[PDB]
């Protein structure tokens, strides 16, 4: 499913100024916007060409919203230090993620609104968009407040409404990239690895979206246990890269095949050395 997600990070830095707030937004695996409270004149800024075309009222309003959330998070960090009786000397992190996944009917499939403090879950909106999960006593304080304020009903309306509406708009305006997979460019390399063994490495480069599967089989059998697989990584131009490698006895290379599955391939590819 297509998805829109915002990732917000607020970090206190006592003795080094006020907390820094950074936010990025994505459609699927494409970033489209950033905001950084430490920038010279902090603004929501485009990072994809399909939102650069949104007009000046759009960017003014997004800027406004970011600035108000940054302010509120400086307060949030203070509050959290108090809830946990933390020292004023320590640095702390509050992270928030919210957004929506788009269903086949063009409506909300799943919405998200959740948070972590110092790397661990704090409070999250439940999948029913009606109720909250608080991880500890401090978070239960926020929960009770938010229950009494009907915060979940407000979030529900945003997630079902605006969030999906904007996602759909972005997907249409960006369709040539967001709705069109770029297939992986694939090849195999061979690296003699001792006097009698060799590494075969199956490469997938230049692909979008990031989801991919690379597997080595020997005699048609998955070598799951003996395959080194790196984590899929960004190329830096909006595409991704991955490889999988296996160490084989020299001369047995022909029994090995690399299998590539990706949404941009109509049938899985097989490569061989």
């Amino acid at each position: 499913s297509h998805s829109m997600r915002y990732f917000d990070t607020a970090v206190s830095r006592p003795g080094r100024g006020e907390p820094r707030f950074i936010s990025v937004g994505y459609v699927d695996d494409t970033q489209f916007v950033r905001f950084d409270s430490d920038a010279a004149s902090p603004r929501g800024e485009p990072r994809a060409p399909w939102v650069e075309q949104e007009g000046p009222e759009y960017w003014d309003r997004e800027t406004q919203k970011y600035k108000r959330q940054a302010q509120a998070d400086r307060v949030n960090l203070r509050k959290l230090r108090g809830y946990y009786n933390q020292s004023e000397d320590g640095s702390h992190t509050l992270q928030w993620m919210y957004g929506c996944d788009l269903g086949p009917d063009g409506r909300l499939l799943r919405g998200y609104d959740q948070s972590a403090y110092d790397g661990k879950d704090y409070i999250a909106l439940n999948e029913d968009l009606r109720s909250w999960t608080a991880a500890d006593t401090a978070a239960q304080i926020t929960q009770r407040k938010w229950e009494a304020a009907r915060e979940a009903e407000q979030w529900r309306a945003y997630l079902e409404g605006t969030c999906v509406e904007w996602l759909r708009r972005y997907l249409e305006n960006g369709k040539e990239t967001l709705q069109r997979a770029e297939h992986p460019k694939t090849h195999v390399t061979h690296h003699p690895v001792s006097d009698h063994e060799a590494t075969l490495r199956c490469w997938a480069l230049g692909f979008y979206p990031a989801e991919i599967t690379l597997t080595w089989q020997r005699d048609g059998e998955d070598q799951t246990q003996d395959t080194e697989l790196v984590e899929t990584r960004p190329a830096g131009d909006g595409t991704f890269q991955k490889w999988a490698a296996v160490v084989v006895p020299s001369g047995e290379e022909q029994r090995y095949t690399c299998h590539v599955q990706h949404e941009g391939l109509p049938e899985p590819l097989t490569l061989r050395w």
């Binding site: 919203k65 959330q69 509120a72 307060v75 959290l80 926020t142 979030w155």
Partner: peptide, 9 residues
């Protein structure tokens, strides 16, 4: 686009 709903803990 961002929500208008600001988190206040």
């Amino acid at each position: 686009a961002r929500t208008e709903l600001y988190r206040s803990l």
